[PDB]
Amino acid sequence: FSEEQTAEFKEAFQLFDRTGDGKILYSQCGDVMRALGQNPTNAEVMKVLGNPKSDEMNLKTLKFEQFLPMMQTIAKNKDQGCFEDYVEGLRVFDKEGNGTVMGAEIRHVLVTLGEKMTEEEVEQLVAGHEDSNGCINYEELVRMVLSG
Amino acid sequence: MGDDEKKEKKKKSKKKAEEEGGDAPAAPPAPKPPSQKRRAQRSGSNVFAMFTQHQVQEFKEAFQLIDQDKDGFISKNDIRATFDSLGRLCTEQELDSMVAEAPGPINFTMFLTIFGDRIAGTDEEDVIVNAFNLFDEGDGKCKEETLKRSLTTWGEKFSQDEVDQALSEAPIDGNGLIDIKKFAQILTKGAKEEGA
Amino acid sequence: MGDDEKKEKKKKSKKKAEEEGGDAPAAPPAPKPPSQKRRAQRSGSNVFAMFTQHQVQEFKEAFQLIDQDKDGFISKNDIRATFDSLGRLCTEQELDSMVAEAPGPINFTMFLTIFGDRIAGTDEEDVIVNAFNLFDEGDGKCKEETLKRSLTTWGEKFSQDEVDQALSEAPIDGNGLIDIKKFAQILTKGAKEEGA
Amino acid sequence: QRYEILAANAIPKGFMDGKQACILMIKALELDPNLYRIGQSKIFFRTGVLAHLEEERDLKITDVIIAFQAQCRGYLARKAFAKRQQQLTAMKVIQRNCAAYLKLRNWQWWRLFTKVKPLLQSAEREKEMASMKEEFTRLKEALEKS
Amino acid sequence: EMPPHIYAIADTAYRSMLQDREDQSILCTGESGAGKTENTKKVIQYLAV
Amino acid sequence: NCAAYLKLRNWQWWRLFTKVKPLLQSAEREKEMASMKEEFTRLKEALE
């Protein structure tokens, strides 16, 4: 990364502290990273954190040359998707095959699959991209997730 | 030169901050290099525009019982008078801490930036309120015992003397010190009693 | 040492009130151990609109209107030719007395020294709406019979003369002297000139 | 439209019949022939199978549907990070404060702006004036389409 | 992991219904004091939380 | 007040309010932002 954007990252680190000495909680790693032009899966991060459970996930600490290498060690990346991948991967609620997507079910997948979203996380991604019957045009729901 | 602007502001800046490191002694305070006027600009600072119609004239709405220089002022010689007669204070040690909101003419065109400096001067809300509102989590507050654990065990460790005085004083309000208000006792919207 | 601050506390006077009005006090503070002067506060500045926002603006800035010869004081000849420059002149005696509402040098400060301090006179307009607005039994008006019968008969009494003068001025409509307007007719942003 | 990417390898080429592509995603995590059942719309499962393969489908969709949920988390965290982006030097300011606490409730510019501050008009107002004109038009437009 | 129980069928019902949109009945059988009375109040204890 | 119109309209240090005294400003944009203020809530409230 250039020193420029890394300075912005130095701040996005610096802000997020606890005892006042260059110390970020493991928890915050992916989220800060996400804002920093990245969407690293919890599974991706968990690899480069060393499999904590909720306890030491909440308790263990990062510092900057643990954070910034992690950022990088995901950032140069492998599979990360595009429109064509995500129209199929968001035709993912087509109910008959309809070019529009299932309202409750888009919420449920988000609770029910891998990286279990809260209710909160589910509703926010979905809401108001359905119609009266609760059909979501995914062809657009795709671009919404893929840019913003 | 422009040191003329700065003699009028060795009068008025000095309004911030040259003797400020008082009982905690002789700090690296406000600098003479002109760019640094904008480090004196820290958060908590609102200054309303010149022909204000009035948030600035509200200072006329109290003007009478404050001023010094009445073609219409409060000079050095008026927080190095008035605060000893209006809001707080100063030892030669804390001299131009508080007197660093006037070491030189608070004209009406500076009353402007003294209720400006009221909602500004000493580390105001974004600093003070948020000192603990950032340790805090949310629509919340901080735990009493944990704040005792702080004050003594975290950083420059303080004495018993210091804790006891700041204990009987601490607004313990439901097992938790009401931090936002321990700071913003000094602020909101319902009093016209002190400082000014 | 701890003293040079306190040396300075005396130039307040040298341009505000005191150089006329030791009447409006310099209030002694500053006891040498400078921890002490935190007891000297003026706690509680509120009542109805003391600086009312369409009045005391004008008064003070009518120093820049009433100082005609542009000296910095207000002479007998200032108030006069400046009233003549509007219209209705006081006689030199009426003026002399109106200057003698202060002991002599009515300058920029002595002017406002008597101006603000005089907080009393007539009733407020919203009280004056309550005057007949509290007599009505609903949202309605005031039957004219009741305003005539009252002014003459009840409590403090008028003469016929006193009512008839008030009656040609009194906005009768629908046998109802709709009181809200007559109140504004007597006392809104009222007439100039009569003081200062 | 869920199991999809259990076989990121099997399905490509834009779009693909529903029903059929499901056999492609389902085979790629073993999902034994006798245990899942296809109608028009409903899928049916035996005791034991559905659900440990739904669970283990969380384990094997990973690849894109975890990388779907990831994009979501992304998009959201952008907006939602907040809570610790702060305290550091202000905590150290609590210490500035505390070394001086003896002199804190003890403060200069406290309350004298705000009791005669219902009684006055002209307020924030110059900040308002320009942006009030902008506010006036906007407020009209937004009410209209509601 | 959610196996043969009045509950088990009741989450089969609770899931399917909402997917398929075909309405659901849970019907006990069998003789006197055979716990229709209860296996019902279990479907009650199931959905209640 | 009624007897004050009959009598107290008469000192030297009270009836000085208009002629050249609305020339001291601090009322212009308020005249607009009184009427606009009423419309401002009439616009906010109905929207929300």
Side-chain angles (χ1 to χ4, degrees):
Chain A
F1 301 135
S2 47
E3 177 50 32
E4 161 202 52
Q5 60 183 265
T6 305
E8 289 171 40
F9 303 171
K10 284 163 182 165
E11 299 170 75
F13 179 82
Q14 275 291 262
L15 270 53
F16 271 97
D17 204 287
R18 185 185 289 237
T19 35
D21 62 331
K23 211 73 88 301
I24 263 60
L25 293 174
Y26 272 21
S27 60
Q28 296 150 222
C29 187
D31 296 357
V32 182
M33 293 163 90
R34 275 150 184 154
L36 314 176
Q38 217 55 238
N39 317 298
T41 71
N42 315 321
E44 285 171 8
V45 187
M46 199 60 87
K47 175 87 65 160
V48 205
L49 292 180
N51 308 272
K53 308 167 273 56
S54 53
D55 46 312
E56 75 294 49
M57 261 305 279
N58 219 218
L59 297 171
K60 279 263 207 173
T61 42
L62 292 174
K63 307 167 187 195
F64 200 48
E65 282 59 34
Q66 295 156 340
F67 179 69
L68 192 69
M70 286 177 206
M71 241 312 265
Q72 304 152 40
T73 44
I74 296 176
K76 51 94 222 55
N77 223 309
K78 37 94 208 73
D79 316 287
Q80 209 285 77
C82 63
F83 179 68
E84 293 62 43
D85 314 330
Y86 283 82
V87 285
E88 161 253 71
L90 274 171
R91 191 146 172 80
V92 170
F93 311 84
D94 266 51
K95 201 160 197 78
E96 285 70 76
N98 300 288
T100 28
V101 137
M102 259 295 272
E105 166 59 74
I106 209 316
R107 293 160 170 97
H108 224 259
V109 145
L110 293 175
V111 187
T112 315
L113 286 54
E115 303 275 49
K116 296 192 173 192
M117 310 302 257
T118 52
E119 2 299 288
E120 328 319 283
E121 301 193 293
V122 321
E123 198 58 59
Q124 286 197 60
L125 185 76
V126 308
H129 303 100
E130 58 234 291
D131 71 14
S132 60
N133 291 243
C135 312
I136 304 182
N137 176 266
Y138 66 95
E139 300 290 339
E140 284 324 305
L141 184 72
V142 175
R143 264 178 280 258
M144 187 287 276
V145 302
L146 261 38
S147 306
Chain B
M1 294 304 267
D3 307 289
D4 309 279
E5 186 251 295
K6 286 188 278 148
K7 275 157 201 166
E8 299 159 57
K9 298 167 204 161
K10 214 85 284 84
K11 303 165 185 177
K12 308 170 187 201
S13 202
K14 246 185 294 98
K15 291 184 164 88
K16 294 156 292 317
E18 304 184 70
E19 292 70 2
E20 206 146 89
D23 297 66
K32 298 179 181 180
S35 57
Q36 303 200 221
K37 300 170 193 182
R38 296 160 296 153
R39 298 176 190 201
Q41 295 335 117
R42 28 40 50 123
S43 42
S45 279
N46 180 18
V47 62
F48 337 102
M50 45 67 248
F51 183 40
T52 187
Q53 301 75 13
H54 60 266
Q55 211 173 145
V56 175
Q57 298 133 42
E58 222 183 291
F59 318 152
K60 291 173 179 176
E61 280 56 334
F63 205 95
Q64 296 67 29
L65 302 173
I66 323 172
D67 137 282
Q68 183 187 74
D69 225 26
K70 217 203 107 302
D71 47 51
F73 310 173
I74 289 160
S75 87
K76 188 154 183 71
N77 329 112
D78 217 36
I79 289 184
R80 235 162 74 142
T82 288
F83 264 61
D84 312 30
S85 17
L86 240 299
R88 225 261 277 160
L89 266 229
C90 32
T91 44
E92 284 295 288
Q93 205 185 245
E94 303 171 293
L95 198 209
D96 303 302
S97 312
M98 177 54 244
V99 186
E101 289 130 318
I106 301 176
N107 310 72
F108 181 63
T109 43
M110 241 87 233
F111 271 77
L112 183 137
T113 185
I114 60 150
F115 291 65
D117 299 17
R118 201 286 66 172
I119 56 172
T122 63
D123 305 297
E124 191 261 69
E125 293 179 92
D126 303 287
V127 196
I128 54 174
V129 171
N130 294 269
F132 268 125
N133 179 101
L134 307 176
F135 180 65
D136 167 60
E137 287 286 306
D139 311 89
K141 186 187 253 272
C142 308
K143 199 184 191 181
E144 185 194 340
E145 241 60 78
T146 291
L147 305 198
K148 297 174 190 153
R149 174 218 41 67
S150 292
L151 298 158
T152 309
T153 312
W154 198 1
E156 301 154 5
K157 299 197 172 183
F158 298 115
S159 70
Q160 193 198 321
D161 300 78
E162 296 181 290
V163 179
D164 301 357
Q165 199 235 270
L167 281 184
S168 48
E169 282 272 289
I172 302 163
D173 167 84
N175 275 309
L177 174 35
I178 188 173
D179 60 281
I180 299 168
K181 289 292 157 169
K182 183 174 176 176
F183 305 115
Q185 274 168 284
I186 311 165
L187 281 123
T188 183
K189 223 289 207 186
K192 213 158 182 164
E193 288 66 276
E194 166 189 39
Chain C
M1 295 301 269
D3 283 85
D4 296 47
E5 44 169 292
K6 297 173 184 66
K7 287 164 170 142
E8 208 71 85
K9 307 281 154 177
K10 292 147 227 63
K11 307 193 186 103
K12 187 174 201 62
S13 314
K14 299 175 191 176
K15 275 194 299 106
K16 77 123 166 284
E18 301 93 289
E19 308 310 299
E20 320 104 34
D23 299 346
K32 290 200 180 199
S35 41
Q36 302 206 52
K37 2 152 190 173
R38 301 183 175 162
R39 302 154 200 168
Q41 249 72 111
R42 41 160 268 205
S43 34
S45 314
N46 182 80
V47 67
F48 284 95
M50 188 173 270
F51 194 132
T52 179
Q53 304 163 57
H54 296 339
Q55 230 185 32
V56 193
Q57 44 174 225
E58 301 140 27
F59 288 151
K60 302 177 273 64
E61 291 147 34
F63 181 75
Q64 297 69 62
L65 302 173
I66 268 67
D67 186 357
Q68 193 186 319
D69 57 14
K70 200 180 182 181
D71 110 80
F73 291 65
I74 300 170
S75 56
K76 297 193 68 177
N77 287 305
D78 284 305
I79 306 176
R80 194 178 60 71
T82 314
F83 275 26
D84 191 79
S85 54
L86 301 148
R88 294 208 196 207
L89 280 180
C90 319
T91 64
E92 200 225 321
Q93 181 190 347
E94 298 166 46
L95 289 161
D96 186 274
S97 40
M98 90 196 279
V99 178
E101 281 164 83
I106 303 184
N107 65 84
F108 208 162
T109 301
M110 195 183 255
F111 179 62
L112 293 162
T113 308
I114 55 182
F115 250 137
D117 285 28
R118 184 263 181 119
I119 55 175
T122 39
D123 320 51
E124 311 189 76
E125 194 170 357
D126 276 65
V127 182
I128 307 168
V129 83
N130 291 148
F132 265 129
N133 280 36
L134 299 178
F135 223 98
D136 190 357
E137 210 66 39
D139 303 85
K141 253 205 187 208
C142 282
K143 196 198 171 196
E144 182 184 329
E145 233 76 62
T146 293
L147 315 209
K148 292 174 174 177
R149 186 203 62 110
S150 280
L151 289 173
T152 325
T153 313
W154 200 270
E156 300 186 14
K157 315 193 189 314
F158 288 3
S159 62
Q160 188 206 314
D161 308 75
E162 288 204 78
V163 189
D164 292 5
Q165 189 199 332
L167 284 181
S168 46
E169 290 260 54
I172 294 169
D173 152 63
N175 323 313
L177 177 44
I178 181 173
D179 56 334
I180 303 171
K181 285 299 100 191
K182 193 178 178 185
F183 300 147
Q185 177 199 13
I186 195 176
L187 244 79
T188 183
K189 234 273 201 190
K192 177 159 175 169
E193 330 75 339
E194 191 223 269
Chain D
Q1 300 305 154
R2 188 204 228 68
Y3 282 52
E4 194 71 281
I5 217 76
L6 288 180
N9 288 264
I11 301 87
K13 226 275 288 181
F15 299 104
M16 194 64 85
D17 173 62
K19 307 187 78 87
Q20 172 274 152
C22 199
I23 283 68
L24 279 52
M25 62 197 64
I26 266 174
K27 277 299 102 204
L29 208 210
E30 278 67 307
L31 276 299
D32 181 83
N34 203 263
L35 306 163
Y36 67 98
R37 205 61 77 91
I38 312 305
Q40 257 306 88
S41 33
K42 308 174 210 208
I43 198 170
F44 293 73
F45 280 82
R46 198 78 77 204
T47 330
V49 187
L50 168 104
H52 190 48
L53 286 305
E54 180 77 7
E55 204 168 276
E56 274 208 58
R57 175 211 36 50
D58 310 318
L59 281 69
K60 259 281 254 72
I61 67 173
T62 49
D63 40 40
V64 176
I65 311 302
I66 282 186
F68 163 52
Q69 304 200 254
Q71 298 275 33
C72 323
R73 303 184 169 295
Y75 184 93
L76 300 174
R78 313 289 130 88
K79 329 300 198 280
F81 60 151
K83 164 54 243 205
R84 284 91 198 162
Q85 66 176 97
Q86 55 203 42
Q87 60 188 106
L88 173 78
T89 311
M91 181 287 290
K92 293 167 179 170
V93 173
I94 309 164
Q95 305 178 260
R96 286 183 174 164
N97 274 215
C98 289
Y101 186 72
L102 314 313
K103 332 77 184 145
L104 192 65
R105 182 235 52 177
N106 267 298
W107 223 258
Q108 12 270 325
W109 295 90
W110 194 301
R111 45 202 137 175
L112 227 156
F113 204 176
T114 61
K115 199 116 59 222
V116 197
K117 200 196 284 190
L119 293 77
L120 298 313
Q121 54 283 170
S122 217
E124 286 295 321
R125 247 115 152 77
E126 218 58 14
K127 286 169 51 185
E128 285 163 50
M129 195 175 92
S131 331
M132 258 180 121
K133 309 302 138 175
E134 291 174 32
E135 184 69 346
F136 193 54
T137 67
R138 185 194 64 83
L139 286 171
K140 297 187 186 296
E141 297 173 27
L143 168 54
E144 293 185 48
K145 71 154 194 171
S146 190
Chain E
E1 58 204 332
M2 300 312 134
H5 196 164
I6 183 66
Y7 288 22
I9 58 175
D11 218 287
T12 283
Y14 188 58
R15 191 73 297 106
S16 314
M17 205 188 320
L18 296 183
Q19 295 262 273
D20 64 15
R21 307 146 77 209
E22 212 191 307
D23 278 282
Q24 301 267 326
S25 58
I26 295 186
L27 302 152
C28 304
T29 44
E31 70 154 310
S32 197
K36 297 77 70 151
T37 288
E38 277 302 292
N39 294 340
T40 279
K41 293 183 226 165
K42 311 310 156 189
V43 195
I44 291 173
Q45 287 166 243
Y46 191 51
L47 292 312
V49 44
Chain F
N1 282 255
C2 292
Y5 172 53
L6 288 20
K7 280 154 274 188
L8 290 71
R9 192 177 71 171
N10 254 230
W11 194 22
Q12 273 319 327
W13 261 84
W14 185 85
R15 176 243 301 151
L16 184 112
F17 314 116
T18 44
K19 297 203 186 82
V20 180
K21 269 163 84 298
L23 192 62
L24 300 318
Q25 293 314 257
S26 35
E28 315 72 78
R29 45 79 128 166
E30 296 311 303
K31 297 177 191 67
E32 211 217 322
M33 273 181 262
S35 180
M36 204 177 80
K37 172 185 67 82
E38 319 313 29
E39 256 283 297
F40 252 53
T41 45
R42 218 254 66 191
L43 293 173
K44 287 167 179 284
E45 295 189 78
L47 168 54
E48 189 186 62

